[PDB]
Write a protein that binds this ligand. Sequence first.
Ligand code: HEM
Ligand code: HEM
Ligand SMILES: C[C@H](O)[C@H](O)[C@H]1CNc2nc(N)[nH]c(=O)c2N1
Ligand SMILES: C[C@H](O)[C@H](O)[C@H]1CNc2nc(N)[nH]c(=O)c2N1
Ligand SMILES: Cc1cc(N)nc(CCCN(C)C)c1
Ligand SMILES: Cc1cc(N)nc(CCCN(C)C)c1
Ligand SMILES: [Zn+2]
Lengths: 412, 412
Amino acid sequence: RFLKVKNWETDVVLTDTLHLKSTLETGCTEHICMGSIMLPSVATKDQLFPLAKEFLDQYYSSIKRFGSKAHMDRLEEVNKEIESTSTYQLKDTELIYGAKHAWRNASRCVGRIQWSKLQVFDARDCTTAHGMFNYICNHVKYATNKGNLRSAITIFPQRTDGKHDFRVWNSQLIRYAGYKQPDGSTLGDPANVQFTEICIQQGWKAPRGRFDVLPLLLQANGNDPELFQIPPELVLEVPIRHPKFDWFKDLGLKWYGLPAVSNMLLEIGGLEFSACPFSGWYMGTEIGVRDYCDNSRYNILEEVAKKMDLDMRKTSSLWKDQALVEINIAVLYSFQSDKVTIVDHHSATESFIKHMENEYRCRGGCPADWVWIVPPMSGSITPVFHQEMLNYRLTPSFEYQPDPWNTHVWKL
Amino acid sequence: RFLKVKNWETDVVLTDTLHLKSTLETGCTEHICMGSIMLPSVATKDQLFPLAKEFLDQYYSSIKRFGSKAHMDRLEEVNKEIESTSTYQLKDTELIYGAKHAWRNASRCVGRIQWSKLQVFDARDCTTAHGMFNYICNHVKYATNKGNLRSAITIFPQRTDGKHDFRVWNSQLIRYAGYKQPDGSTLGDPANVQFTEICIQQGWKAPRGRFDVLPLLLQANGNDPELFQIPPELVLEVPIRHPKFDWFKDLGLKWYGLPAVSNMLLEIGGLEFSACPFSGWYMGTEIGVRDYCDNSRYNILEEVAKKMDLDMRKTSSLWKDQALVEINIAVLYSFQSDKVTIVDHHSATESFIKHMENEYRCRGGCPADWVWIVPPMSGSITPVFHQEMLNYRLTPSFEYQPDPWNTHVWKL
Ligand code: HEM
Ligand code: HEM
Ligand SMILES: C[C@H](O)[C@H](O)[C@H]1CNc2nc(N)[nH]c(=O)c2N1
Ligand SMILES: C[C@H](O)[C@H](O)[C@H]1CNc2nc(N)[nH]c(=O)c2N1
Ligand SMILES: Cc1cc(N)nc(CCCN(C)C)c1
Ligand SMILES: Cc1cc(N)nc(CCCN(C)C)c1
Ligand SMILES: [Zn+2]
């Protein structure tokens, strides 16, 4: 019950004890492992104080005032507020702590070496969709910082009864539009055709092109959501060129600078923040491999191999592989030459190994999801391929949640 | 308890029921997943008949004579033999069935679309190390078939008391030698320096070069093992050249045609065959990615990028990625131009999807280990990246076993 994880490139072994503090369930049993399933399987007052207590015990353990009176009174204070209101409110300091540690515990995140440099924006006084748009714009402007990207999170009011929720319906703050065609094919991003749908169904007059930035669909206090278009001066975009292949520009491609997940739920001490958009900087493969070359996304391996003069008749000519490397050297090169923060999969996966080392040392482990930590190209020549990893759920945490256009009791 | 696995490239869903027949344990619990651990965690007469029965029930269920008298008498016959001898002996037909299904159930194998075309060689009458060498040579000659590779397994006598075992100490029948250097570096294959050690410690006069084929270390009936050198005419090797880069040959590289795992244990109806070397044909990435570019193996990304004229100062120039594709196009090209069977990672991963489909259809599922099915380069542009998979242990099965030079009560 004090398990070992081995590196088979360097023979390094580390002992994981942190998994004992694990609480939630993984989906695996003694008889079946689900480590490759993408997402496997209202709260009451009685359930709440345990979670509040457990969170408060580790927060006070963190600043080395574990059993102080400040702890004991905060324990009693939160209990009384869960008695009086059946819920409770986080101190500003407990909100920053819980947010940083939700990132820290995100086992599918390879970037977590940065987990303690997170700017937390307290948006819990927001009441209207216009207010969110304002908070969200301030987040985009800050996090972007003129290409010197900065990591940030904006935390909107916590769930209360359930039907007053606050949701950003967008899956990312900044995404390109998806338009099906009359001939069946797709313009823009096929991932977003169902979301691009609702925007038009709500009055978005679409500039039916490729890289059309979508409008924010913000829902406040369970009310029907409302469209707001981000000032284009705040949407920083990088035009993609190759450092050797001059025909690259005629491909006419670009991506946005800022990756910002907006569809997840932040859980802290048993309180649920259903709108918590958070941003970092891109690892290059997210764009060059998945965004551009997923079959059901932009799907550009066809044209890149064309202008490279490649043997596309035979599968075993690895034309697909060869065009995938060039695309990623160019995504990397274009961001760097505009001073926009980006990290290659080699540097990122090395840092995560080093971070993992710090976590086993000063924390006793580090929950990691191999299936997600290994980059989607050149796997075994990055050091995370050869690193055994233990996956387990720790809290505070980011969780998935139903897409809001399936839950919502819609009306007007 | 009738789980679903989804493909996120094609939206295809399949229902897995086969996992209910799962028996062994995976290493995961409800609270921790070990799907990325490489290998996680004498038999008595009382344990044996259940396993014999379970195996016999599915074998007779397979030829559509489930509850026949031929089944009932074979059940009684094996029971009586487990009473009389505390063990039992497989019919030739039960040996071929069990072997084919051990391959079928090998969840880390992407090639299993071929699982029913397996030539089974019954070596259970063997008694001496010289006999094994003879059986093993006949296997190499057959399986190689002049580059028209054929899949085969040779099954030596089953474990009895424990200290009369039969083991092939080699991890593969055909591997290149590993020699450390006086200056610390390594010649040949660094994976094999500890095994190349014992060979020399047993009288192997090493031709201390790079691609020196190793001698077989065969142990028969628990006796101390003995060296035998495979006739070089039976060891077919492919010289690696690129279809564009003429400097490629001066790298002077070659690999052997036949991949043949020899260090695993075959479990059938509770009987344990500790020497069961089995062979197929190579997926190209096993050679071009892992053998050649693993840091602790041949580690050739240095020199290939050199003669390509690449930016090796900067990590984010993806020089490593670009030299990895070229190496794999050349491994593929060299094998094909000599008519030696090899499969690219695209064709192989497509077939496994199709095989998976057949298994959910006519069998109710297919145990798969994602971490091992996804190829070690260009992951997400092959269809297995996007395919959820359930892992569970079915029997008959191939299992790992201690390296014999740690178990052996050695003497002379
Ligand atoms: C600072 C730079 C960061 C980098 C380079 C980075 C890198 C990555 C990458 C490559 C993924 C793979 C997921 C995918 O393929 O879509 C990921 C997922 C994730 N990241 Fe990080 N990340 C960063 C910052 C952050 C921050 C600030 C947070 C939260 C406060 C965060 C939380 C997560 C979570 C929760 C996931 C997985 C959830 C999901 O996508 O299903 N990351 N990250
Ligand atoms: C017919 C062509 C075959 C191909 C193309 C193929 C392909 C592969 C590949 C790529 C792996 C990855 C393992 C690694 O990276 O080292 C693997 C593993 C494995 N194969 Fe298959 N295979 C074939 C035939 C067979 C046969 C005939 C058997 C047994 C009778 C078998 C049983 C296994 C097992 C048990 C493993 C995993 C055990 C381990 O390596 O730890 N395969 N195979
Ligand atoms: C730590 C990790 O389990 C290890 O690198 C595994 C990952 N997946 C693999 N997959 C295959 N096919 N072969 C391997 O050697 C490995 N190595
Ligand atoms: C089926 C499989 O779980 C799915 O393709 C996963 C695999 N690993 C991944 N890893 C990352 N980082 N991102 C992904 O979208 C996925 N997709
Ligand atoms: C914070 C953050 C960092 C990063 N590098 N990438 C993202 C986008 C993740 C998109 N996937 C959820 C589809 C977010
Ligand atoms: C039968 C078989 C097929 C294949 N394609 N490859 C192998 C070698 C596997 C080596 N690993 C165990 C290190 C064996
Ligand atoms: Zn698992």
